[PDB]
Design a protein around this ligand. Structure first.
Ligand SMILES: CO/C1=C\C(C)=C\[C@@H](C)[C@@H](O)[C@H](C)C/C(C)=C/C=C/[C@H](OC)[C@@H]([C@@H](C)[C@@H](O)[C@H](C)[C@@]2(O)C[C@@H](O)[C@H](C)[C@@H](C(C)C)O2)OC1=O
Lengths: 345, 159, 750, 69, 198
């Protein structure tokens, strides 16, 4: 059954990850951080939490919202890499697949900076250090997607995800990099869903299938809305951008591909009840993040499931985002929307 | 060739003596491998715990001592003209100690890996790791005890 | 007189301090020097970064961070840190020293800030000089390569780390298709870098290409992967000229680096002679304010109200010490000490000697006892080593354990003076534990007649062998008497030695587990009597006592009685006690063998007593609580306690057989080791026999001291820990007590 | 000097234990020569273990002299 | 799958052999009755004892590592839970205690029997009873140990978050240990009437 064979290889991983989940900030700690006055007070309050003295080395004058975000992200990624480095086999492949999602965003950001000719230091700083293939800084110069693939992407584990992008024009621009990111991440989602279905066992299999369906629906909606403002989108070609593993597939994805207006997008999403209210009113990204947190909370209810690792990682990424938001609001003293944080624990 | 002492009676004694060391060595090897993976993983970050965290490998090896002890004691009563009762006593003792030692070695390997990986982060977990490893080793000890109890009856009132 | 609180926790009174701010710092100093006050968090209602002394704690935290940065600089630029004078503050006891003034702390803060500024400036200068020197050294190395290295702008020759040389090679191959001429060499010496503050091994590389767009492409690719590219004149004469440019500018940079390094190491060595004292002073200054942070300051007045948990015994000592502090300062103050009577939970503090410290560490690892609860560390002192001895049971291995513990016990002063490791601090704080275990193991080995798996024929055996018998003939000894002390030595090497020793040890385990359980259970009665919980006595003690003395006390009584009856002489058959116990439950009223007259009546009476006490223990206490939503919680908790009690009755009685199991395992391993190691050497004779005897005894002693004395003496030790934490403490250890952590100054290692 | 201490302790324990064993062999102790599986010749084994104990005594005195200096 | 193919081939071979024996008129030659009567009851008794202790220890170790991995994993942030969740390991090892006790009780019935009364009714009954009671105790202790280990892992993970979870999951763990207790009771009941070999 569920836990009979799990603890042989992933018992320690599950225990430590669920302890980390226990370390997630609750509503009371979020309120306490909200009531701070300066960034030094925020650091002192975070010392009492499970962050520990992660900002101990940082001086009072050096303490900045960007630096607080950097240290929180560094602690989160150190924890994730420690957990990955204590796991092997299916769990290690699961962690690698998790990292691939950030790696795709990293390569897309590097290419966007390459055409945009932004500062190299800031480009490296903005990149997510979890997804780091050895030739990632090479991306600051390479532009042609054929040269891109042959000199970089074949080396990376992103090679299987680059299949049908050769059809487009060889010159690469912002639209080209956006569509390449969408196609690559869709292929990655298909491969990850297949890996979860075949190798990841129950109940983690069903839980991560649902989570990946939610992620695929989220990015399908995002891609449709971001391409709606563009007039160079082909309805049939957009099917290569919308992932096919989500709950929208196949009818709702088909309608979204044929959707050309916001009302058309709503009609396409009318098949699923959960996503109708997201476009009905309110902030769409806020609703996506809230439902993602709810799904993570539901994922943490299941014991002896490796999906708790993904639930933890999403939860603490949102936690770092909330800490950054609170720190920025405190530094700017614009506490009108300081309580606009999403928490479920 | 006697009805009480068949010609296949020594087979059970010999195979029990072989199994007593085979299964205990398999369990000890699993424990040693898992604990070695854990120790080598932790020593990259905390080299000072290299000699403190070798306890799981040591306790995995005691299972091999139990198997060797049962194999040695079984050979005492082995013989060509031995009764089927003695042969099955030897087989039962060997199977008991072997399966118990295999389970104990598996448990020691898993818990020792977990404990060495979790004691570098939290030094207070060394005591808990040692306790659970003792709880896993006492199972091989119980298999040893059952094997000894069976062996005590191997060559008593046997004709 | 100070109460010797070993049987129960020390009596405590909550004390309130009316400290004015004029002498608040000195009062905190004296209270921390005393080390007898566990301060209560009176100011817990307010959230952080809002407390009274938050800014002054933050200042000292910043100074501590600066001192940690100084220590990091001292470690990276290898310098031994001079330890401070521990005897200056006495690092303990109730003695008071002259404390640093506020001006001293302000001077420490300002000096730390200014010197951190100076050190970071000098470190930045040194880092830039070092990185440019490293770049010039790499350029010198690439100029020092052989002529054939550059023969195969026309190249991108440079230096890259070996961590990326393969990746650079392969990516350049894929960029240039089949036009790669990647020739690389290795820098033998490790290359230190200031960007990552670590040493990385680098590999100089060269690639040949012609196209201007291609050469810029490959230059940017190489520069992307943290490679310091260089330019070469492409001629041997040009290489010689460029190298002549090098090693002359390198001389000036080496001179500048040497001067800067000498200055910086002078500063750091000046720090090393005084950093430890500064760190200790700053840690004490931060601790006193953290303690003062937990005070209900009155804004209208100037009084800091602080509540602490001092034992009643040292209340007079604290009053005298505060009077001494007042006399030293000379400031007149109102009544500063006011004893309070509250309903809080006082901490659990047991005064431990050097002998009982380890046993109490054992008994506190499981959990902290309640206030004025029966201490589990007093009976542990004897029970734990004795259960370990029962499982261990060897006068030779026990002697080795005794010698190993005595080496620590007699030399404990020197070991206390010197630093100890994790495995050395342990087994030295429990040196008396190991001594008691060794002595009791020697005693049990005497009672087992087991000396290095052999037997001692000290007294006359009660067994007489037949007058005469043929060689190889099975002989049965006849009883002549009883062995005075220990197991008979006529049982050594016999075929049915196991059949007797196993029964002896199983019944020993059962009896000494029943006795230990009833001794622990009477501690529950002692706790209830001390706490005046008569309803607890009626509803949890008497039912449980009757249950265990009817189901398992009866078993022990029958075990003792069966030994005291000469069944062969009397003529009655020997009653199987295990079958009797089984039939006592699975078939009431049926007895196959008569142990004593009216056995069935007593057995059914005891079964009825247990089956009546189960509802008694399950219901009477909840019934009293109902007849004095909480009722449901009490009722459910009593159900859980009842079921756990009934289960762990048989569970604990069955698990006490681990004493017999480990004793048998230790004896069998000892005998088998003797057989495989020394008994082999006896057959051999001559020079080869002597050499084999020496080698085999060495191997036997090594294996003994490795697995039997050390490791089999570790399994028994931890199993006795288990029997005390679970089988013994659950009887009377309520637990969930507040540990005693007084505000005391200690030497905090950097 | 840890090796010297270890060998000193081991050799002293040898001088004690093996001398006791050889004395028991010389007196024809029941626990040592009282079984058909046990060696038949008592004094021969006693002399062999006497020589082994003398070798261990030489080792003990040598290592103790090394420790003392 | 090689294992599935082996199982299918074994099934086909068994069916073909049975049909060949049945059709030719030698169907009674596959006689399990003669196999049980002519098999030495010492084999059954010793296999029952060995499998009882082995499977009890296997279940104890199974629960022990399942609980210990979770205890160590959740103890990294909350080391205080190890001593409180040691009750879970105790409940996992009590099944090994049960198997050891049953093995002692059964080994008390291992007496040498005469050649003429080798396969008597009482001896065959003793062999069958010891074999099947040992199988029952061993399998019940295995199952109980696995269940108690799963419950203890959940209890450790849950009381790392809040100590109030242990006092409510200990009920489920006691329910799990009841299975091993009942297995021991039934194993004793089966061998209660089984007398020693004579
Ligand atoms: C090479 O022969 C060693 C072990 C072997 C092969 C034993 C076989 C008989 C084995 O088949 C048996 C089955 C297991 C056994 C009998 C282990 C005892 C090991 C010794 O331990 C006393 C260590 C011990 C000296 C060594 O491991 C460490 C240096 C250490 O001393 C470091 C200390 O910090 C630590 C406290 C201590 C503890 C963990 C025992 O070990 O000798 C060895 O390596």
């Amino acid at each position: 059954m569920e836990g009979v064979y799990f603890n042989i290889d992933n018992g320690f991983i599950e225990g430590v990850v669920r302890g980390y989940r226990n370390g997630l900030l609750s509503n009371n700690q979020y309120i306490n951080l909200t009531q701070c006055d300066t960034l030094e007070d925020l650091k002192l309050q975070l010392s009492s939490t499970d962050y520990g003295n992660f900002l101990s080395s940082v001086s009072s004058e050096s303490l900045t919202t960007s630096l607080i975000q950097e240290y929180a992200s560094s602690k989160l990624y150190h924890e994730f890499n420690y957990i990955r480095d204590q796991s092997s086999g299916s769990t290690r492949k699961f962690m690698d697949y998790i990292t691939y999602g950030y790696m795709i965003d990293n390569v897309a950001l590097m290419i966007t900076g390459t055409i945009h000719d932004r500062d190299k230091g800031e480009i490296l700083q903005r990149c997510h250090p979890l997804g780091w293939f050895d030739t990632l800084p090479t991306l600051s110069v390479a532009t042609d997607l054929e040269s891109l693939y042959e000199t970089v992407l074949v080396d990376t584990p992103l090679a299987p995800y680059f299949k049908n992008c050769f059809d487009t024009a060889e010159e690469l621009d912002d639209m080209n990099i956006e569509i390449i990111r969408n196609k690559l991440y869709k292929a990655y989602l298909e491969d990850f869903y297949n890996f979860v279905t075949e190798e990841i066992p129950e109940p983690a299999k069903e839980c991560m299938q649902t989570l990946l369906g939610f992620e695929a629906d989220r990015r399908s909606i995002n891609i449709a809305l971001n391409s709606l403002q563009s007039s160079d989108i082909d309805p049939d070609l957009k099917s290569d951008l919308l992932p096919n593993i989500g709950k929208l597939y196949p009818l709702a994805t088909f309608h979204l591909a044929q959707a050309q207006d916001f009302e058309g997008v709503r009609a396409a999403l009318a098949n699923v009840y959960e996503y109708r209210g997201f476009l009905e009113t309110g902030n769409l990204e806020d609703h996506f993040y809230q439902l993602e947190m709810e799904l993570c909370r539901d994922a943490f209810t299941q014991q002896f499931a490796i999906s708790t690792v993904w639930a933890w990682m999403k939860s603490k990424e949102q936690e770092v985002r909330n800490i950054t938001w609170i720190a920025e609001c405190i530094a700017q003293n614009q506490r009108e929307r300081i309580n606009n944080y999403i928490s479920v624990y | 060739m006697t009805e009480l002492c068949p010609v296949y009676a020594p087979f059970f004694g010999a195979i029990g003596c072989a199994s007593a060391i085979i299964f205990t060595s398999l369990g000890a090897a699993y424990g040693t491998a898992k604990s070695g993976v854990g120790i080598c993983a932790t020593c990259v970050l905390r080299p000072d715990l290299l000699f403190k965290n070798i306890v799981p490998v040591i306790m995995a090896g005691i299972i091999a001592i139990y198997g060797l002890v049962v194999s040695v004691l079984v050979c005492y009563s082995l013989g060509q003209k031995q009764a089927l009762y003695t042969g099955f006593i030897q087989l039962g003792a060997g199977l008991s100690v072997g399966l118990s030692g295999l389970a104990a070695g598996f448990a020691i390997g898993i818990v020792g890996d977990a404990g060495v990986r979790g004691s570098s982060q939290q030094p207070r977990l060394f005591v808990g790791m040692i306790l659970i490893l003792i709880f896993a080793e006492v199972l091989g000890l119980y298999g040893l005890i059952v094997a000894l109890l069976l062996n005590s009856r191997a060559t008593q009132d046997v004709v | 007189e100070k109460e010797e609180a070993i049987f129960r926790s020390a009596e405590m009174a909550l004390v309130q301090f009316y400290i004015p701010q004029e002498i608040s710092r000195d009062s905190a100093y004296t209270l921390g020097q005393l080390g007898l006050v566990q301060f209560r968090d009176l100011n817990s209602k307010v959230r952080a970064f809002q407390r009274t002394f938050v800014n002054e704690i933050r200042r000292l935290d910043n100074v501590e961070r600066q001192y940690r940065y100084f220590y990091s600089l001292l470690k990276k630029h290898d310098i031994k840190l001079y330890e401070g004078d521990t005897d200056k503050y006495l690092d303990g006891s109730g003695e008071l020293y002259v404390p640093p003034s506020g001006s001293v702390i302000d001077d420490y803060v300002r000096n730390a800030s200014y010197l951190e500024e100076r050190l970071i400036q000098m470190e930045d200068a040194t880092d830039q000089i070092e990185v440019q020197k490293n770049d010039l050294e790499q350029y010198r190395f690439i100029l020092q390569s052989g002529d054939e290295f550059f023969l195969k702008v026309n190249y991108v020759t440079g230096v890259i780390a070996r961590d990326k040389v393969a990746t650079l090679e392969q990516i350049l191959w894929r960029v240039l298709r089949g036009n790669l001429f990647f020739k690389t060499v290795e820098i033998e010496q490790p290359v230190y870098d200031v960007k990552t503050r670590e040493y990385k091994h680098k590999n100089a590389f060269i690639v040949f290409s012609h196209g201007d767009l291609i050469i810029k492409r490959i230059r940017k690719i190489a520069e992307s992967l943290d490679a310091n590219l260089y330019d070469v004149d492409s001629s041997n004469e040009g290489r010689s000229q460029q190298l002549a440019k090098v090693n002359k500018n390198l001389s000036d940079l080496y001179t500048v680096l040497k001067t800067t390094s000498t200055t910086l190491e002078s500063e750091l060595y000046a720090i090393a002679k005084e950093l430890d004292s500064w760190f200790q002073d700053v840690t004490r200054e931060k601790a006193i304010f953290e303690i003062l942070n937990k005070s209900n300051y009155d804004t209208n007045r100037k009084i800091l109200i602080a509540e602490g948990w001092i034992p009643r015994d040292e209340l007079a000592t604290l009053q005298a010490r505060l009077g001494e502090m007042i006399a030293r300062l000379g400031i007149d103050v109102p009544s500063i000490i006011q004893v309070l009577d509250t309903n809080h939970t006082p901490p659990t503090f047991h005064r431990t000697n050097k002998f009982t410290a380890g046993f109490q560490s054992i008994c506190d690892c499981y959990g902290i006892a309640q206030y004025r609860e029966i201490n589990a560390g007093l009976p542990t002192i004897v029970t734990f080593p004795f259960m370990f001895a029962i499982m261990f049971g060897d006068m030779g291995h026990g002697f080795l354990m005794t010698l190993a513990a005595l080496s620590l016990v007699l030399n404990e002063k020197k070991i206390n003076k010197m630093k100890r490791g994790e495995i050395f601090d342990m087994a030295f704080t429990g040196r008396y534990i190991i001594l008691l275990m060794g002595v009791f193991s020697m005693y049990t080995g005497f009672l087992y007649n087991d000396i290095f798996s052999k037997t001692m024929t000290i007294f006359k055996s009660g067994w007489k062998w037949p007058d005469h018998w043929k060689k190889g003939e099975s002989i049965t000894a006849t009883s002549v008497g009883t062995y005075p002390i220990g197991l008979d030595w006529a049982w050594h090497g016999t075929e049915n030695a196991l059949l007797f020793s196993n029964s002896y040890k199983m019944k020993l385990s059962i009896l000494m587990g029943f006795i230990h359980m009833t001794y622990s259970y009477f501690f529950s009665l002692a706790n209830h009597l001390y706490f005046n919980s008569m309803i607890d006595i009626i509803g949890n003690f008497i039912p449980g006592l009757l249950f265990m003395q009817g189901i398992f006390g009866y078993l022990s009584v029958c075990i003792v009685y069966k030994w005291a009856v000469d069944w062969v002489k009397d003529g009655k058959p020997a009653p199987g006690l295990l079958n009797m116990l089984i039939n006592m439950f699975l078939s009431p009223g049926t007895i196959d063998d008569e142990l004593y007259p009216h056995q069935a009546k007593v057995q059914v009476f005891l079964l009825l007593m247990a089956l009546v006490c189960i509802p008694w223990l399950l219901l009477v206490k909840p019934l009293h609580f109902k007849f004095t939503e909480d009722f449901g919680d009490i009722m459910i908790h009593q159900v859980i306690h009842t079921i756990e009690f009934c289960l762990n009755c048989v569970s604990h009685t069955a698990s006490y057989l681990r004493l017999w199991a480990l004793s048998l395992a230790h004896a069998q391993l000892s005998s088998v080791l003797w057989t495989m190691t020394i008994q082999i050497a006896f057959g051999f004779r001559g020079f080869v026999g002597v050499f084999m005897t020496v080698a085999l005894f060495a191997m036997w002693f090594a294996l003994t001291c490795a697995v039997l004395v050390l490791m089999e003496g570790t399994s028994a030790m931890l199993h006795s820990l288990r029997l005390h934490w679970v089988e013994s403490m659950s009887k009377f250890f309520v637990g969930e007590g507040l540990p005693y952590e007084p505000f005391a100054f200690e030497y905090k290692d950097m | 000097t840890g090796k010297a201490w270890c060998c000193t302790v081991l050799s002293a324990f040898g001088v004690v234990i093996l001398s006791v064993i050889a004395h028991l062999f010389n007196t024809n102790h029941e626990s040592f020569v009282g079984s058909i599986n046990d060696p038949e010749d008592g004094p021969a084994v006693a002399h062999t273990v006497y020589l082994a104990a003398l070798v261990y005594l030489v080792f003990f005195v040598f290592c103790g002299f090394q420790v003392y200096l | 799958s090689f294992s599935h193919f082996l199982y299918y081939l074994v099934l086909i071979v068994v069916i073909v052999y049975g049909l060949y024996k049945l059709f030719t008129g030698h169907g009674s030659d596959i006689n399990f009755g003669k196999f049980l009567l002519r098999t030495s009851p010492y084999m059954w008794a010793n296999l029952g004892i060995a499998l009882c202790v082995g499977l009890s220890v296997v279940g104890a170790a199974w629960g022990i590592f399942i609980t210990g991995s979770s205890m160590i994993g959740a103890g990294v942030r909350a080391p205080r839970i190890t001593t409180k969740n040691l009750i879970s390991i105790i409940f996992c090892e009590v099944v090994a205690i049960y198997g050891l006790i049953i093995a002692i009780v059964f080994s008390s019935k291992l007496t040498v029997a005469t050649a003429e009364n080798m396969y008597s009714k009482s001896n065959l009954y003793t062999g069958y009873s010891l074999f099947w009671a040992g199988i029952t105790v061993g399998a019940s202790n295995l199952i109980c140990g696995i269940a108690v280990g799963i419950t203890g892992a959940t209890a450790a993970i849950s009381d790392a978050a809040d100590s109030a979870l242990f006092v409510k999951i200990l009920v489920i763990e006691i329910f799990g240990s009841i299975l091993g207790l009942l297995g021991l009771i039934v194993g004793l009941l089966m061998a209660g009437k089984a007398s020693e070999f004579q």
